[PDB]
Amino acid sequence: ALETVPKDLRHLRACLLCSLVKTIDQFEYDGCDNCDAYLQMKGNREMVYDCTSSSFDGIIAMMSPEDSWVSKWQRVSNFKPGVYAVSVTGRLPQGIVRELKSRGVAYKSRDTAIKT
Amino acid sequence: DPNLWTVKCKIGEERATAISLMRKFIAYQFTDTPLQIKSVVAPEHVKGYIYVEAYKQTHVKQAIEGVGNLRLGYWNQQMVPIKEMTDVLKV
Numbered sequence A: 001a002l003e004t005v006p007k008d009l010r011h012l013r014a015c016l017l018c019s020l021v022k023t024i025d026q027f028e029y030d031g032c033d034n035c036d037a038y039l040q041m042k043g044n045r046e047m048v049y050d051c052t053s054s055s056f057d058g059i060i061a062m063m064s065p066e067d068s069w070v071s072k073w074q075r076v077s078n079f080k081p082g083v084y085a086v087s088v089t090g091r092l093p094q095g096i097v098r099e100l101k102s103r104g105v106a107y108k109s110r111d112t113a114i115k116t
Numbered sequence B: 001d002p003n004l005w006t007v008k009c010k011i012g013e014e015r016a017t018a019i020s021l022m023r024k025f026i027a028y029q030f031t032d033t034p035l036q037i038k039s040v041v042a043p044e045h046v047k048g049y050i051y052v053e054a055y056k057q058t059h060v061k062q063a064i065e066g067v068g069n070l071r072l073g074y075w076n077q078q079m080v081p082i083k084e085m086t087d088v089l090k091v
Helices: A024-029 A046-051 A069-074 A094-103 B014-028 B057-064 B068-074 B082-088
Strands: A012-015 A021-023 A055-060 A084-089 B003-008 B039-041 B049-054
Touching: A012 A055, A012 A084, A021 A024, A024 A046, A046 A094, B003 B057, B003 B068, B003 B082, B014 B039, B014 B049, B014 B057, B014 B068, B049 B057, B057 B068
Parallel strands: none
Antiparallel strands: A012 A021, A055 A084, B003 B049, B039 B049
16 A cells, blocks of 8 residues: 555665565554564664665566466565565575574575576 | 556656656546556666556556656557567566
């Protein structure tokens, strides 16, 4: 919804798990809207910097994951409508990755770009 | 799957046109005239025109009958080749 819709072009940075592209303002006010329960994106900034990537190539204004071959490719047919990044450059800390694995959420890298 | 249509936009203002059209879609999605298009692609290295993901040129026209930046392409639209979806999103 409009809450997930970014408001300005300043300080855009994409998440590492759902590749959600939103500004620091709504990351502070709400954090993530996809895996907030699994990540605790809200209430801090240092861990937000580690759990979000400022380098993303290409974005998609997907709204219908259930009938999108875009969503098929980028494995967000199960996530909500929103703005997602085609490529995300970064990786979670080993501690957070281990925590997610223990909770049963394997971390799949969103870096789909072809490195040479 | 929906097909891509090439619509001409003011040089250097494709991003602004995309933002404006998505804002208008937000404002008019709950109205009696929602936008039936699925998405819009504005490649970083493509200037002069953008791609609209829709099933019909009628849908494309009804979506682009907003800001005047797309007036030149409003008269007619051009299909994107079937093989060209893979190339559309390459960076």
